[PDB]
Amino acid sequence: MFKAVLFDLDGVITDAAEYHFRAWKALAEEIGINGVDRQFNEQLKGVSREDSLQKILDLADKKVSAEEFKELAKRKNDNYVKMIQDVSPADVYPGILQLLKDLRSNKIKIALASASKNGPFLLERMNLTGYFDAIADPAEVAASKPAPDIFIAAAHAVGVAPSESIGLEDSQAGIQAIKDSGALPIGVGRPEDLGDDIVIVPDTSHYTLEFLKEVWLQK
Ligand SMILES: [Mg+2]
């Protein structure tokens, strides 16, 4: 059987993106720039905080000093951090808490393989820290998804080869990173986005230990 599950965070454990979105939206609103909506957040998701601020300024063709840029960056941070103080166990996606308990009940290693630089804080807020054997630090990998580095690092952080692991992901580039690591990917979403050659569940309630074991045995 698989010895570890490498968990992406955003779109698997919880909706982490909503908070960054709401922070940029509030900042834009505050300084009188229109256009940052859910669709436009596409442009901001997975993107540097500073590239993100610049794209927002370009919606209104505004230029600013370095000090005003710094001020606006800080404001978005303040916004973001205030909002994530309200994250709780109620923000855990369905199935995930029971999955984590079952994986620990079954002695399988659990690691985080998230691009979130606030993963530890977010797991603490969700009361999940205790389930995790390791958190792969996205600041310590040279390449983001779709490069495999973060899944390799997560597997290694629990003393396993990626070939002994399942990866769970909601993103196409994440699925690619899992594949290229050696680990076995199981997606949440749809094949149109994730690919036609992996097992995909429609939502996280389907991620059960029973289901992962069956997928492992069938692959
Ligand atoms: Mg994700």
Curated annotation (Swiss-Prot):
Impact noted for substituting residue 170 to A: Impaired, but active with an increase in the affinity for G1P
Effect upon mutating residue 20 to Q: 8-fold reduction in the conversion of beta-G1P to G6P in the presence of beta-G1,6bisP
Reaction catalyzed: beta-D-glucose 1-phosphate = beta-D-glucose 6-phosphate
Active site: 8 (nucleophile), 10 (proton donor/acceptor)
Modifications the protein undergoes after translation, according to the UniProt entry: Autophosphorylated.
Keyword Nucleotide-binding belongs to the record: no
Taxonomy, superkingdom: Bacteria
InterPro entries from the UniProt entry: B-phosphoglucomutase_hydrolase (IPR010976), Beta-PGM (IPR010972), Beta-PGM-like (IPR051600), HAD-like_sf (IPR036412), HAD-SF_hydro_IA (IPR006439), HAD_sf (IPR023214), PGP-like_dom2 (IPR023198)
SUPFAM superfamilies: HAD-like
Cofactor-binding details, from the entry: Binds 1 magnesium ion per subunit.
Any one GO molecular-function label of the UniProt entry: beta-phosphoglucomutase activity
Protein family: Belongs to the HAD-like hydrolase superfamily. CbbY/CbbZ/Gph/YieH family.
Protein name: Beta-phosphoglucomutase
Originating organism: Lactococcus lactis subsp. lactis (strain IL1403) (Streptococcus lactis)
Gene responsible for this protein: pgmB
